[PDB]
């Protein structure tokens, strides 16, 4: 259960291991079974200098390999260590590392005029904020009404009944459910507020001239064939609702298709789940000038000395002054010479 510092054979820092079993053989030789602590590099920064990871790698090595004993603490105990008690011997672990798999338990803030907000000064006791509230909001339901829960509830039932009777005038349970959806209710809560919470006045609103009112959400409102189009466009373009419109329902507004989508997801029948250029030819005079002046030129010397300047004047003088006047040996012979005179 102790932790030890083993030989690092490369010269590098010691390898750390936990002792699982200490064994002595018959000839008195001592060997140890040891679980490896891996260094962060070897695990192949938030990692501290002294991080070590508990591996599933198990090895056995002789006791002579141990050069020192150490402490590999919990993370909390490392962080609690005092400055004086800080040592070379103290290490820590907080991770188990599978060495075979590689598995392991399971950005700047700026300052300046172009980052911070200009802070709005507190108004004087005489100063006024100057903010037009009608440009900012428009009320849709007052919470302190002369009405009671019962009456509102009742009105909601009535708003629902009208709705069902409305759609009876151009499936019973279906029409009632249709009329019971939220759009109708919301419309019922506005009808109340618009009519100043006067039940008697609000009911007129619902039956303006003896005729009822119909509120239909995009779900109910779409035609059979539009609904059909939608189920083809979805199954074909997934949830790409701009293309679903462009190619399948271009007469509908995007935002109505969205509202429809979500309402459709609850459908019953819906079951998704289960340098320097030049030329040279050399004249036939300067060709045999080299042969005539072989002793001055020395082609054997000049061939392996391209950056020695050849005496161009001398051979030209001697060639004009002295105007009036090879077998290679085969490859069989040279290979025979090379073996005869070897390295």
């Amino acid at each position: 259960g102790d932790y030890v510092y083993f030989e690092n054979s490369s010269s590098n820092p010691y390898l750390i291991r936990r002792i699982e079993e200490l064994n002595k053989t018959a000839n008195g030789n001592v060997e140890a079974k040891v679980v490896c602590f891996y260094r962060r590099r070897d695990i192949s920064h938030q990692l501290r200098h002294r991080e070590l990871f508990l591996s599933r790698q198990l090895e056995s090595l002789p006791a002579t390999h141990i050069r020192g004993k150490c402490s590999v603490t919990l993370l909390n105990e490392t962080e609690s260590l005092k400055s004086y008690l800080e040592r070379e011997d103290f290490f820590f672990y907080s991770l188990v590392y599978d060495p075979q798999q590689k598995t392991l338990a399971d950005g700047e803030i700026r300052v300046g005029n172009r980052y911070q907000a200009d802070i709005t000064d507190l108004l004087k006791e005489g100063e006024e904020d100057g903010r037009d509230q009608s440009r900012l909001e428009t009320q849709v339901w007052e919470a302190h009404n002369p009405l009671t829960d019962k009456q509102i509830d009742q009105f909601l039932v009535v708003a629902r009944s009208v709705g069902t009777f409305a759609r009876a005038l151009d499936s019973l349970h279906m029409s009632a459910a249709a009329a019971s959806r939220d759009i109708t209710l919301f419309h019922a809560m506005d009808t109340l507020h618009k009519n100043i919470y006067d039940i008697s006045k609000a009911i007129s609103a619902l039956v303006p001239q003896g005729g009822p009112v119909l509120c239909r959400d995009e779900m109910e409102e779409w035609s059979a064939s539009e609904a059909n189009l939608f189920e083809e466009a979805l199954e074909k373009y997934g949830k790409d609702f701009t293309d679903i419109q462009q190619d399948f329902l271009p007469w509908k507004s995007l935002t109505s298709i969205i509202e429809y989508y979500y309402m459709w997801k609850t459908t019953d029948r819906y079951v998704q789940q289960k340098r320097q250029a030049f030329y040279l030819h050399t004249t036939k005079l300067t060709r045999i000038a080299r042969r005539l002046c072989r002793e001055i030129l020395r082609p054997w010397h000049a061939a392996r000395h391209p950056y020695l300047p050849i005496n161009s004047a001398a051979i030209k003088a001697e060639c004009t002054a002295r105007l009036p006047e090879a077998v290679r040996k085969p490859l069989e012979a040279v290979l025979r010479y090379l073996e005869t005179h070897p390295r």
Binding site: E235, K236, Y237, G238, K239, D240, T242, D243, Q246
Partner: protein
């Protein structure tokens, strides 16, 4: 073929529903360059564009 606004101008995305077999009903997503070259995966698209776009956070399937 839908414009993909987060890619450079002219790039388009198309989603195709599989009509039969083992994955009938699943879809495949394709991208097209402005010239009409077809791409079938994120690493293929990233190799083509190179450093002209950063696709680290690009969701190939949704185009966002």
């Amino acid at each position: 073929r839908m414009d993909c606004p987060a890619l450079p101008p002219g790039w388009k995305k198309e989603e195709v529903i599989r009509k039969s077999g083992l994955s009938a009903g699943k879809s495949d997503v394709y991208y097209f360059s402005p010239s009409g070259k077809k791409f079938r995966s994120k690493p293929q698209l990233a190799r083509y564009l190179g450093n002209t776009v950063d696709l680290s956070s690009f969701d190939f399937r949704t185009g966002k």
